[PDB]
Design a protein around this ligand. Structure first.
Ligand SMILES: O=C(O)[C@H]1CC[C@H](C(=O)N2CC[C@@]3(S(=O)(=O)c4ccc(F)cc4)c4ccc(OCc5c(F)cccc5Cl)cc4CC[C@@H]23)CC1
Length: 253
């Protein structure tokens, strides 16, 4: 049950929820493309301490995940599932949603990402000691650039990243399956109607997004083992919660 109106109405409320919950405006990100970090500024970032860079990136990651919580809270029928399923979906999905959202701050053209006010390439994150991880993040953004996503496509796709009935630990598995289906119908209908069905074959596999979150938790478990007090005192609580009950607080406001 759902007609060609109830499926279409979902499309526009998904695009709306997404529009209203992005950390950065795409128009803004596009106009700052020529504001690039100097050779001296890149060298300043490389000279910064690993733990300083870690705290900066973790703070920025937390900043973005907070907007993913607001996207989830406005997503049709997400607030109607149980609190345990809301956390299950956000714990597993929020990072992946930022991993897709991230492509809007990318520029395949110059291979740079927007960070702390200006655009900069992979070598801006050398201090982190995440040679392969930052590389994967950059390649993942490069691959999504090739798809030339519309904002409405990013909205429907990210909503499907978050609404995954296959996430382990889901209590009302069928209530999440029912929701995932309507969003899939809304996405594929919008792709059909816009003559953009050809993207389906080119969307990244399920494992591309899964290995990225896993690599993040692996390098984090390494950094935390060498600087445990740095993570306790300077890392954000919601960051430590997601990768190391703030989510329950966010889910009420
Ligand atoms: O408008 C929006 O909502 C979007 C605006 C743009 C936002 C965005 O680009 N981002 C939100 C924060 C940022 S970043 O700008 O700090 C950045 C960092 C590394 C990059 F390769 C590129 C960018 C980020 C932060 C941490 C991270 O992994 C976890 C992590 C740590 F935490 C700490 C150390 C190491 C790691 Cl690996 C990965 C990414 C990728 C997406 C990036 C995404 C949301």
């Amino acid at each position: 049950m759902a007609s060609l109106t109830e499926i279409e109405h979902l499309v526009q409320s998904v695009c709306k929820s997404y529009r209203e919950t992005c950390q950065l405006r795409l128009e803004d990100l596009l106009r700052q493309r020529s504001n690039i970090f100097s050779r001296e500024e890149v060298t300043g970032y490389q000279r910064k301490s690993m733990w300083e860079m870690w705290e900066r990136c973790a703070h920025h990651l937390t900043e973005a995940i907070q907007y993913v919580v607001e996207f989830a809270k406005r997503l049709s029928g997400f607030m109607e599932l149980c609190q345990n399923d809301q956390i299950v979906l956000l714990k597993a999905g929020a990072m992946e949603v930022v991993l897709v959202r991230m492509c809007r701050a990318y520029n395949a053209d110059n291979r740079t990402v927007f960070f702390e006010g200006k655009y900069g390439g992979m070598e801006l994150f050398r201090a982190l000691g995440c040679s392969e991880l930052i590389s994967s993040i950059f390649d993942f953004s490069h691959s999504l650039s090739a798809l030339h996503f519309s904002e409405d496509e990013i909205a429907l796709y990210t909503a499907l990243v978050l609404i995954n009935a296959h996430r382990p630990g889901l209590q009302e598995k069928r209530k999440v399956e029912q929701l995932q289906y309507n969003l899939e119908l809304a996405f594929h209908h919008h792709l059909c109607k816009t003559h953009r069905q050809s993207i389906l074959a080119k969307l990244p596999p399920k494992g591309k997004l899964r290995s990225l979150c896993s690599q993040h938790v692996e390098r984090l478990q390494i950094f935390q083992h060498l600087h445990p007090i740095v993570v306790q005192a300077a890392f954000p609580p919601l960051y430590k919660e997601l990768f190391s009950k703030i989510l329950h607080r966010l889910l009420q406001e």
